[PDB]
């Protein structure tokens, strides 16, 4: 039974584990970026280095950004607005080219075209009555 419950929950756990590992790659990378160069058996030298630096700064931003320019800010500011415009309007294209929208749009128009053609037929009956009356008069 433990074999069975291990087998039948394997796929969901495997997908969640892969995705959680891919998420925690960032935590691993930033942690190892913030650690000192020297190993734990030799970290006392880097520790006294940070101690000496801290007392030197006292006696006298955790991340990895890129630091670009204003013209660059303008180019990435433009770059985002292509990505906005392409997204919403392709979403509009996907919605307009879908089957359920096409069937609904066809159906409401066969609505309007049947009532309107019916107006064309019922009004038309007046015109041949007028044409027969005109041919009768002349």
């Amino acid at each position: 039974l433990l074999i069975a419950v291990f087998n039948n929950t394997f796929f969901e756990v495997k997908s969640i584990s892969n995705q959680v590992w891919k998420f925690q790659r960032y935590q691993l990378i930033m942690t190892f970026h913030e650690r000192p160069v020297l190993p734990p058996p030799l970290i006392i030298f880097s520790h006294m280095t940070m101690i000496f630096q801290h007392l030197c700064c006292r006696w006298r931003d955790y991340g990895l950004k890129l630091f670009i320019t204003d013209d660059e800010l303008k180019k990435v500011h433009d770059f985002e607005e292509q990505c906005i415009e392409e997204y919403f309007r392709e979403k509009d294209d996907r919605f307009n080219s879908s089957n359920d929208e096409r069937i609904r749009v066809t159906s409401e128009r066969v609505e309007n075209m049947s009532m309107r053609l019916e107006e064309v037929n019922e009004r038309e009956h007046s015109m041949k009555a007028s044409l027969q009356t005109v041919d009768i008069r002349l």
Partner: peptide, 30 residues
């Protein structure tokens, strides 16, 4: 939005992902 940025330009997507956000406490999108 990340998908659309990746489809357009891979580098400008990374620069979107890394540049410092002065209006959001100097943070990063990542």
């Amino acid at each position: 939005l990340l998908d659309q940025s990746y489809k357009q330009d891979e580098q400008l997507a990374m620069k979107l992902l890394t540049y410092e956000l002065k209006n959001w406490s100097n943070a990063t999108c990542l």
